[PDB]
Structure formats: structure tokens, C-alpha cells
Ligand binder design. Structure first.
Ligand SMILES: Nc1ncnc2c1ncn2[C@@H]1O[C@H](COP(=O)(O)OP(=O)(O)OP(=O)(O)O)[C@@H](O)[C@H]1O
Lengths: 395, 56, 216, 56
DNA sequence: GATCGATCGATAAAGTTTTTTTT
DNA sequence: ATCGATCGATC
């Protein structure tokens, strides 16, 4: 067990001790859980007075033989009839998608296209696996880019506080993002194990990494396979193993040539390989133009921050991750194909060309949008938010 | 249409098991026909018909 | 690119050190054309060879006996015609003229395995005649160099004459020099025109831009 | 002489066309599939590598 | 002096991701 | 923990 690296004041790296448990609580702790344990303290082994020549060698391995491993949250969220009925009463209004948007980040103005996109992504959409067939990309993977110091990196880390067991990395240039590279450490003298780097934690969770263009070539081939394919398989020095992972990235990058996002090609703009650009959908370009009422309003909201709520918000999504999935309305599927074929003929006569897989977005956004409604019917109103959200991402 | 059901019933074709033509490929593999002489009397100038248009 | 690019110098296609061109005695290309009397005939070959002494090792023991037993001598009867070729040749110098004997020996060593033959050189000169049919139209050629350097010399002198200082900026030299004559290329003569003239007390390099020229 | 001609494709759809080729390759006899990573060109042919404690 | 029995001492372990200049 | 070698005691 490491140290929780926030209440340990920085004068040292995190230390560690270890614990031997028994049969009742095995396979209970995933790597990356805020665990709480309590047991006896115990030394064992012989040391210092063994037969000869044990000079300056410690001989008391500190161990813990313990019980009652407790997870904490700072899956266990119990709720009575009262609070479960309030969210039924808070499923009633025709505005709750708009109230939940601005009730998320109470420090930054605007970007309601962005502020709806995060909550739409974080709750996530379903993947109906094909019987004797390849399932499709039931995850969702959004991307941002912006001219610098426009809070493009601010909102990426407060999703980690309400993560619901989604611990992300920071994107450091190392191989191990989704692999092991045969790290075994002999597994107590003679056993070889494939200890997972960062995909045993991302399963049914979210990750976020920074500085996409500011990497070497190793991660570029690494995010190639693990996006088009749900899993990874490797025999580094051992055996092939197809371990699965349901994950979804959150990206961030910066344009290189300063303030050039208007005078040049809007595409080919950062020239990281467009296989990833094709495998992502939403490429928001954050604008920061000068409006004299905008910055004036900005100047006070940075002053009133030196002093409908969060735990109700996280309970809502982690209850709405376990309910029904409609997928079906024979006329809501009719309006969207009219809503695509026009811009399928208005893709080259505009800025961005689209592809056929973009149609699978247009169901998937509205699929989770009905999950906000908590209803077993695909409605009609979902095919209007999915339209104009793309219309801002494309115009 | 593929998301309403969990199948692809389309294109009005009676689907065939892949073992059938797998045998027919193996059944064709027990034939190996030998060419006649009428073919190369005509394809010799078909190459000539393929000659000047690329050289045009 | 695609071919052996005729009505061009064929040497500039194959990017190659011009020393090692001299490290081959005779070269030959192949030919290609529409060629309606021959490609029709070549189709008749592949029309056949598909439907329905020429040994394989018996000739190999025939040569691998002979290539170490017979070491033939040369008589005067070859050297009289041999000097007649070179006195007509000068109407390269010696490298082409040396190794022809190294192949004229082997043709005599092939059949008449005692001595040289006085007339098998008369088709040995035919094979290397085919080598010098391939360079009628750098590597071994100086016409282009002569046409270029003289032209380069005029303009530089005029530019030097034109100013109190030696200010020849980049925006000037892309203008008038390019305008001059359209016999030289547009941009593939704007780099190498100064590096040979760097060593001859004329100019200096200060990036893709300003420069500094010769004073007197 | 040569047999067994080789046909190549090109083009950039958004359909992820591996299902349009390699689904045939997963039912065709003796049709093995590969990708970019893993088996390189030296890893295409055979090689000598590390093995377990048995015959390396 | 030789042979047998008992006691004491010595003998067995394993590797293959980060980082440097360099082409 | 097991095997081998050396030393001591007994016949
Ligand atoms: N558009 C904005 N509206 C309100 N506050 C902002 C905005 N942009 C920046 N800020 C303020 O800036 C602070 C931190 O910004 P941040 O460091 O996230 O920029 P950034 O996204 O890291 O830029 P970059 O990623 O290019 O370095 C926050 O406290 C936030 O209040």
C-alpha cells in the first residue's frame, strides 16, 4: 500500500508497507482503490543474532495480518426510498439537461456546447455486442484544441474528483500506457506475470492525457490499435493474452503556429496522424475573441471565487448507469437520415468532410441523451440536440 | 436498419453456407483445364489493342 | 522515373558516381518502342511455350575444364589492327582501350584454345561499338559546364560594377538574373552558382537572404 | 514460371474496410491474417528467438 | 591397526524497461 | 535437508 499523496507534505516520496490477508477478502481490491484496512502489527523472522556475520542487516520484516478491507469514496452508495423518489421527482421537468449543464463547473463562463458534451460523455452509451459478430465502438471519445490559456486544461482534472473509479494518467512519454512489457520481478522466485500498466483501471471508466503532438512516435502506434480494437494482446517475453478493456479517452493539444487557426487550412492543422482524427469525432476549436462585455463579465467572476450540487450529481449518473436502454423509434430514425444526407451533400461545399462512421455518432449521442431522461422510449426531442451540437462543431 | 433488429435481412438473396463453394473450389481444383488454340489467335492482337492506346 | 528517357542524357537518370562509370568497360541498355513488327512477333513467342545439343551441365564441365588449363599467348597479328582502332578512336582514352583485350583474349580462349586470333577482335570491337552507340544524345561531359560558367561570369561582373558598396541582396538576384535568358533553369541554378564562386574571392553566405560581395 | 497473381486495393472510406476484406479471410481455407504491429518483415519469415528452459 | 558409526559442515537460487550518444 | 568426509572408539 502506498501513501495517499495529498496529506503527506512534500519532503519525501511516498513510502510503502505491506499486508498479508486471508481467504475472506481475496480478489476484493483492484489496483487503484482507496482502501482502508486494520489489523495487528507484527514482526517475524530471525535477524541480527543468526549464526554468524549478520552485520548492519535489518532482521525484522514489519507485516500486517489483518481483516475488514473497506473501500471508500473521498459503488457503496446506498439510498433509501426518499432520495430515490426525489430523483424521480427530479426526472420530471423538461429542462434538466440544461440545469445539469451549468451546475457542473461553477467557475468558468459559457461553452454550453462543451458543458453538455462532458456530461453526455461521462455517463456514456451502451454497446450491443453482436452475436457471433464484432461489436462496434460503443464508447465515445471527444477531443479539444485551443489557443493557449483559455481553460482548455482546467476542466480536464475536475472530472477526476467525481470520477466514480476512473483514475487517469497525465501522458508521460513511456511505453506502458496500455501494456506491461513483461515486468515480472520473479513473483517471489520463479514465476512470470504480466502486470498491467494502465488498462486494468480504465475498464468502464474514463482517462485523460495531455500534449498529444508533444510526444514521440511510441504512443502514436500505441493509441492506434487500442482505439479501433477494444483490447490488446502481446507476447513480450511470455504468452499472448487477449485482456479486455472498455475505455474512452479525453484529449488535449495545442496548435503550433500561434494565432493561425483562421488564415490557413482549418484541417491539417496540427498534422498528428489523421487515423486518430478519423477515429475521433468532435474537434472543438476554442475561440477567444474580444468582446467588451465578455471580458468585463470575466473580470468580476475571477474576483468572486476566493472564498444542483456535486454529491447529488454523482449519485444521479451512477444510478442512471444501471437502467434501461430503448434504442428504438421508427420515426426518430427517419428524421436523422434527412438530417445527415443534406450535409452529406453539404460536406465538401463547407469546411469539414465527414465519413460514414459519423452516422454511428448520431445515434450514440441521442442514445445517451435519452438516458438523461431515464425513459425506455427513444423520443423525438433527442434528434434536435444532436443536430445543433454537431452544427457548432462543424460551423 | 441494422440497429432495429439484431441481423441484416436484406438484398432478397437466399444465403448459402460457405462450405458449399469451399467444396466447389476444391471441386474446381480437380479439373485444371488445358487451353485450346483458338484463344491465342485472338488475344495476340488484343494485346496489340492494348498496345497503341497506352502509347497514345 | 519510368524508362530510359530517350532524347536526353541517359546518365543523369541513374544517379551514380562518375568514377564508377569508368569502373565498367562496356555498358549496354535495352531498347523499347511500339514496334509493331517485333512485339507482334514477341507475342508469338508467348503464344507458344505454354501449350502441351542444348545441355545443362555438359557445357559447364566444358568451360570449367578450359578456364584453368589453357593460358593463351598473343601474337603480333592482333596488335597491328589493335592500334588501328585507337588511331581511329581519337578522330575515354585508355580504360576503354585496355579491357577490350581482356575480353578479346577470352573469345580466342573460348574456341581456339592455344593462342590469340587475329580476326576475333573484329567483332570484339563490334560489341564495344554498341557501347559507344549509347551516348550520342556531369559524368564525362563538359559541354554544359562550358555553356554555364561563361554565362555566370558576365552578370556577376556587371553587378559588382553597379554599386558603391557590395550590397547584392536576395530579392535583387531573383529578379534580373532570372529575367536574363531562359536557357538556364528557374531555381536549380540559384543554389550552386555561388558555392564554386565562394572559393574564388567573390561572395559570402548569410542565409536565404542578404549577402556580401567582392570589393576593389 | 510464376502463378498465383496478387491483387491490391487502395482508397480511404470511413467504413473501416477490414470487414470488407478480412471477413472473407476468416472463412477462407488457409487464409491467415496479419497487421502492422507484431510480425514485421523480418517477423514475416522465420527466425531464431528465446524460448523457455526446454530446447531453445 | 582397521573398520564402522556418528557428527559436523557444506551445497543447491534468478535477470532483460529506462536512459545515453549516434547515424 | 541430505550427503560426504573426517575423527574417534571399539574390536
Ligand atoms: N475562458 C476562461 N474563463 C474563465 N476562466 C478562465 C478562462 N481561461 C482561463 N481561466 C482561468 O485560468 C486558470 C487556469 O487556466 P488553465 O491553466 O487551465 O489554462 P490551460 O487550459 O492550462 O491553457 P494551456 O492548456 O494552453 O496551458 C483558471 O483558474 C481559470 O479561472
Amino acid at each position: 500500500v502506498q501513501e495517499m499523496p495529498e496529506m503527506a507534505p512534500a519532503g519525501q516520496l511516498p513510502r510503502s508497507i505491506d499486508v498479508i490477508l486471508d481467504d475472506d477478502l481475496v480478489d476484493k481490491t483492484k489496483p487503484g482503490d482507496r482502501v482502508n484496512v486494520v489489523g495487528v502489527f507484527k514482526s517475524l523472522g530471525a535477524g541480527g543474532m543468526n549464526q554468524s556475520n549478520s552485520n548492519t542487516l535489518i532482521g525484522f520484516k514489519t507485516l500486517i495480518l489483518g481483516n475488514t478491507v473497506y473501500p471508500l469514496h473521498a459503488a457503496r452508495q446506498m439510498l433509501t426510498d426518499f432520495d430515490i423518489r426525489n430523483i424521480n421527482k427530479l426526472s420530471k421537468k423538461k429542462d434538466i439537461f440544461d440545469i445539469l449543464s451549468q451546475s457542473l463547473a461553477p467557475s468558468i463562463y459559457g461553452h454550453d456546447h462543451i458543458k453538455k458534451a462532458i456530461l453526455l460523455m461521462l455517463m456514456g452509451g451502451v454497446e450491443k455486442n453482436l452475436e457471433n459478430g464484432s461489436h462496434l465502438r460503443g464508447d465515445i471519445n471527444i477531443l479539444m484544441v485551443g489557443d493557449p490559456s483559455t481553460a482548455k486544461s482546467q476542466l480536464l482534472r475536475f472530472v477526476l474528483n467525481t470520477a466514480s473509479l476512473a483514475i487517469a494518467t497525465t501522458g508521460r512519454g513511456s511505453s506502458g500506457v496500455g501494456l506491461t512489457a513483461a515486468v515480472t520481478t520473479d513473483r517471489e522466485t520463479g514465476e512470470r506475470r504480466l502486470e498491467a500498466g494502465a488498462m486494468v483501471l480504465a475498464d468502464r471508466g474514463v482517462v485523460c492525457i495531455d500534449e498529444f503532438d508533444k510526444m514521440t512516435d511510441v504512443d502514436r502506434v500505441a493509441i492506434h490499435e487500442v482505439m479501433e480494437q477494444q483490447t490488446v494482446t502481446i507476447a513480450k517475453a511470455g504468452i499472448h493474452t487477449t485482456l479486455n478493456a472498455r475505455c474512452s479517452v479525453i484529449a488535449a493539444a495545442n496548435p503550433v503556429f500561434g494565432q493561425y487557426d483562421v488564415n490557413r487550412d482549418p484541417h491539417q492543422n496540427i498534422a498528428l496522424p489523421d487515423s486518430l482524427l478519423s477515429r475521433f469525432d468532435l474537434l472543438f476549436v476554442v475561440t477567444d475573441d474580444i468582446n467588451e462585455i465578455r471580458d468585463r463579465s470575466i473580470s468580476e467572476h475571477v474576483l468572486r471565487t476566493h472564498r444542483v450540487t456535486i454529491p447529488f450529481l454523482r449519485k444521479y449518473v451512477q444510478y442512471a448507469k444501471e437502467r434501461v436502454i430503448p434504442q428504438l423509434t421508427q420515426e426518430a430514425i427517419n428524421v436523422i437520415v434527412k438530417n445527415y444526407t443534406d450535409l452529406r451533400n453539404d460536406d465538401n461545399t463547407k469546411k469539414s468532410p465527414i465519413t460514414a462512421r459519423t452516422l454511428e455518432t448520431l445515434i450514440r449521442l441521442a442514445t445517451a441523451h435519452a438516458k438523461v431522461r431515464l425513459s425506455k422510449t427513444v423520443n423525438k426531442v433527442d434528434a434536435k440536440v444532436a443536430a445543433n451540437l454537431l452544427r457548432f462543431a462543424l460551423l | 436498419y441494422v440497429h432495429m433488429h439484431n441481423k441484416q435481412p436484406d438484398l432478397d438473396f437466399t444465403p448459402v453456407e460457405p462450405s458449399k463453394m469451399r467444396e466447389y473450389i476444391a471441386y474446381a481444383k480437380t479439373k485444371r483445364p488445358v487451353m485450346s488454340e483458338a484463344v491465342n489467335d485472338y488475344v495476340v492482337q488484343a494485346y496489340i489493342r492494348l498496345r497503341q492506346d497506352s502509347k497514345r | 522515373g519510368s524508362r530510359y528517357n530517350p532524347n536526353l542524357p541517359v546518365t543523369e537518370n541513374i544517379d551514380l558516381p562518375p568514377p564508377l562509370l569508368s569502373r565498367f568497360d562496356l555498358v549496354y541498355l535495352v531498347l523499347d518502342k511500339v514496334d509493331e513488327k517485333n512485339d507482334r512477333e514477341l507475342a508469338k513467342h508467348l503464344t507458344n511455350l505454354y501449350l502441351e545439343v542444348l545441355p545443362v551441365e555438359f557445357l559447364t564441365m566444358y568451360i570449367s575444364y578450359a578456364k584453368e588449363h589453357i593460358h593463351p599467348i598473343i601474337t603480333e597479328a592482333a596488335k597491328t589492327e589493335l592500334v588501328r582502332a585507337y588511331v581511329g578512336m581519337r578522330k575515354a582514352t585508355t580504360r576503354q582501350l585496355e579491357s577490350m583485350i581482356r575480353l578479346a583474349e577470352a573469345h580466342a580462349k573460348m574456341k581456339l584454345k592455344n593462342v590469340v586470333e587475329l580476326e576475333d577482335v573484329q567483332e570484339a570491337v563490334r560489341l564495344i561499338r554498341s557501347a559507344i552507340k549509347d551516348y550520342a544524345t556531369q559524368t564525362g561531359k563538359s559541354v554544359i559546364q562550358r555553356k554555364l560558367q561563361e554565362d555566370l561570369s558576365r552578370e556577376i561582373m556587371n553587378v559588382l560594377k553597379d554599386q558603391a558598396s557590395d550590397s547584392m541582396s536576395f530579392n535583387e538576384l531573383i529578379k534580373q538574373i532570372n529575367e536574363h535568358s531562359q536557357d538556364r533553369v528557374e531555381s536549380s541554378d540559384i543554389q550552386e552558382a555561388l558555392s564554386r564562386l565562394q572559393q574564388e574571392d567573390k561572395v559570402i553566405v548569410l542565409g536565404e537572404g542578404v549577402r556580401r560581395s567582392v570589393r576593389l | 514460371i510464376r502463378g498465383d497473381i496478387n491483387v491490391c486495393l487502395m482508397g480511404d472510406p470511413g467504413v473501416a474496410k477490414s470487414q470488407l476484406l478480412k471477413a472473407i479471410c476468416k472463412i477462407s481455407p488457409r487464409g491467415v491474417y496479419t497487421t502492422g504491429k507484431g510480425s514485421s518483415g523480418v517477423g514475416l519469415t522465420a527466425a531464431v528467438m528465446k524460448d523457455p528452459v526446454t530446447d531453445e
